[model samples]
Target: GMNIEKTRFCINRKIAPGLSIEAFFRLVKRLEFNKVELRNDMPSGSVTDDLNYNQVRNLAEKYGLEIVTINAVYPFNQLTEEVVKKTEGLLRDAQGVGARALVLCPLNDGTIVPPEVTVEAIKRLSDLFARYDIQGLVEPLGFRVSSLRSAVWAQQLIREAGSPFKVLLDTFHHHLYEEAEKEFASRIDISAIGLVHLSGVEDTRPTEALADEQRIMLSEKDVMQNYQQVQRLENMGYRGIYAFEPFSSQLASWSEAEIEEQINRSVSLLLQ
Candidate 1:
């Protein structure tokens, strides 16, 4: 059953952009989060920035953290030589840092990828993920232009591919997708979920107009109903990590105290 302790929370790099890698780990340590998600989108561009993987590993060990996943390969369903090389590099980094999984997000630029194409992509990547000993987590984006917007449909693609990859369900994305509630209630395999990305959107704009900048910490004004989403997911028997991945520009200017306060407040609200 789900309880406060049983619910493991993870921090993503998107929320703590100002901190150095070690400082980021230290922040998580101060907050008592043992798991974190690293990213390639940091200011330095490199996932580990100037530091090598061993340094990353050492810092994680110093902070007693579990590197749950590296925050992702974009438009992963579109196959190209570039995608191959980038994925190889990220996979190697994931392995070096002892991360348990790698996140794969689909194209969000309105270009449609036929379900078969995505299925084949998953099929091909399954071998690589297995070889690297890292789980592949497919995250369906919820933007209006997103190619894959439904978590249920993403799971179907995995099924069709006969692959071992799992789905990443983001609360913000789930709320953006109109059919998510019905499809999830009827068909979602709770155990097949690899991870859950948590964020709250308080923007007043229409859902279709929403962008990453609108995402922020949880609060009473959150129209996305993240608390309900978390409760529902937990009730469905999901025990995976719920990673905080708010992409709001406000986070870039937040101080360490603000970061910790927001995280603690959001955690408090979600448990309700």
Candidate 2:
């Protein structure tokens, strides 16, 4: 059985859209979770852009929390000079804020990025992380139109890059784009997983019909089987933080007390 305390859990800032930076940190700290992921897509743009690195670092310190990863540099696999420069800024800010890793999301539009481009970008980005002495968490979106849609493909790219990069395995994305067979899950390179973003969809719609809006906290009715996926990962020796990343508009409107209660209930339900 998974021990709730030992099972490190985190929450992305998007999970609580209405809260201020300080309030969000306090909420997570109050919940006894020490890890958090901040986003670059807030209303004012990147979190670092909105709040200085020192403010972020000092707040995390005040809350006794760790900034796990900055979520993220977008279209990261495009390998353009512009993206590179942007990534440099993100990396610098992340490092300044004591973030342990930087999440890299590939272009999610319908177009498929060329393999060479992805490979090249992976190598370059990995080297960049090396230069900054920070880790990269490559997250492959599972949308039908996403360029980098498969964890296996992402793993191959990472191996070819031959850098100290890790994968951000999202349960919702996994359910959407990858095979759900336990054997397939068991075959994943567990060591390469740095973070796991957990969300669930309880809607009656087919998996293909699900979107970010359908993402919400896990419950018995969750149709995506996040609990099973997480169990498989844990059983396979993946000891990493499972971050709550529900993207529901309803969840966004939740009060802090409601969010805290639901989070506690969700964790207990999932780990039990």
Candidate 3:
């Protein structure tokens, strides 16, 4: 029931780490993608900083593309002074480069941040983002060690914060969280999903053992049932962009043509 025509694709910088910012923009245009997600922690420095606001903005205009979100502010739920400072800096850069949102990722290194802390952080982050005239995309990591690891928790935090924020649902994280209950899935407030990061796991390792390195472009070998998750979200009327976020070095090392071909094949597999 997912139509390819209705599908909007966005590519994250992780998909092609070897490319320069201009080359990445060119790649996205070449692949007929109109949206992209830049990152704050790439080796090339902050995507907006590595290339200045004018350079990034000019290139996006030249390529007829939009930089969707800066693929995130980390340890967002911690709200420490360092986190706040980093978030403010990143949000400033993201807005200057005309990005529409800032992705906020919770601490994922086994530090347990309480629910109230998360709510307070969301409130503070939402307020900061609003000051910059950008939206906040709350991304709940599904790693066992992640401080905020479930969609249910994120939604509640957003509600309590009562700020203009939305959720980011990553298929890879969703699977890792074992969020498979039909009741849980059915209860999702689809409209709150601002974006969906789509990736596949082809490795044979047990699900719990899977890491970012295991992420690859979608294919029959994929073990993550990404298509099924997309179908569920689609059926629930979540018509947001599905950004490819394969973190495999194999993918990042691909030739431009090879990357294009794989993306075409992978997307076709997802929406057909």
Best by TM-score: 1
Q: How would you encode candidate 3's per-residue C-alpha lDDT over 1-272 as one tens digit per residue? A: 46845238898888877788888899889877899889976777766645678888999999989899997888887788998889889888888889999999998989889899888888888778889999999988888888887786688789988977998989888888865354456567888888999988889888778888889889989898889888887787877888999988777579888888888988889767
With a 3 Å backbone cut-off (N, CA, C), the pairs that clash in candidate 2 are none
| lDDT head-to-head 1 vs 3, winner | 1
Deviating ranges (above 4 Å) for candidate 3:
179-183
lDDT of 2 by residue, 80-169 (tens): 889889899888878899988999999988887997889888888887898888899999888888898778778878888786888899
Judged by lDDT against the true structure, how good is candidate 1? 0.88
Ranking of candidates on lDDT, top first:
1, 2, 3
User: How much is 151 displaced in model 1, in angstroms?
Assistant: 0.5
Task: Evaluate all candidate structures by whole-model CA lDDT and list the values in order.
Answer: 0.88, 0.85, 0.84
What count of clashes does model 1 give?
0
Which model, 1 or 3, shows the larger TM-score? 1
Name the lDDT value of residue 66 in candidate 3. Answer: 87
136-252, model 1: which lDDT tens digit per residue?
999999888899999889998999999888999998898888777776777888888899898888888888788889999888999998877888877888777888889988998
**Which residue pairs come into collision in candidate 3?**
none
TM-score winner between 2 and 3, please give it.
3
Q: Candidate 2, after superposition: displacement of residue 107 in Å? A: 1.6
